[PDB]
């Protein structure tokens, strides 16, 4: 039943909070003249704190989207917390150094709003698609914990470490 479209993962990554950071961030890439973006920017630009907000329209052969991003939870090299619109969607990364690493723990927080674009449409019908991104999420998020983990252990050294 559409009640809370909420899923998160956490994961003990072998690399330091720098890798981990600069892995999870995903959005800033070579851009200086908008190739693959139409225009996307990020809060290093102006100041990344609370309230900020980094925007970033995509250009494809198939669809033009953009992305605004509140960063609504700003602690350095602790968590690094933005929402996709007013409190619509979450993606909530929380960063613990170790003294071996950093554990990454992400949070989605897909609220009911977001969940009315699908409901006020169909209700009956848009079940699925409300159940299609909470399962997409759900097999999505640890996915992409492993694949954070993976990527930065191979770099790091990728021999030895292998089960």
């Known amino acids: 039943m559409p009640k809370s479209l909420t899923f998160e993962d956490s994961i003990n990554?072998?690399?330091p909070i720098n890798q981990v950071y600069a892995l999870v961030s995903d959005i800033t890439r070579t851009g200086e003249w908008s190739p693959v973006c139409e225009k996307c920017w990020w809060d290093e630009d102006e100041g990344p704190v609370v309230g900020a907000h980094f925007t970033?329209?995509?250009v494809t052969p198939?669809?033009?989207?953009e992305t605004r991003s509140e960063v609504i939870?700003?602690?350095p090299n602790r968590c690094f917390?933005?929402?996709v619109t007013d409190g619509n969607v979450?993606?909530?990364y929380s960063m613990e150094p170790l003294e071996e690493g950093t554990v990454l723990?992400?949070?989605?927080?897909?609220t009911p709003?977001?969940?009315r674009f699908f409901h006020d449409k169909f209700g009956d019908k848009s079940i699925e698609e409300i159940e299609k991104r909470r399962l997409a999420a759900i097999t999505g998020i640890p996915e992409t914990l492993v694949a954070i983990q993976r990527i930065l252990e191979v770099e790091l050294e990728h021999h030895h470490h292998h089960h």
Do not use: L, P
Request: no cysteine; glycine share 10%; charged share 30%.
């Open 13 to 15: 990554i072998a690399a």
């Open 90 to 92: 979450k993606w909530i």
């Open 56 to 58: 970033g329209r995509n």
């Open 81 to 83: 917390g933005w929402s």
């Open 105 to 110: 723990t992400e949070s989605w927080e897909f």
């Open 113 to 115: 709003k977001g969940q």
């Open 73 to 75: 939870v700003a602690e």
């Open 62 to 65: 198939e669809r033009t989207w």
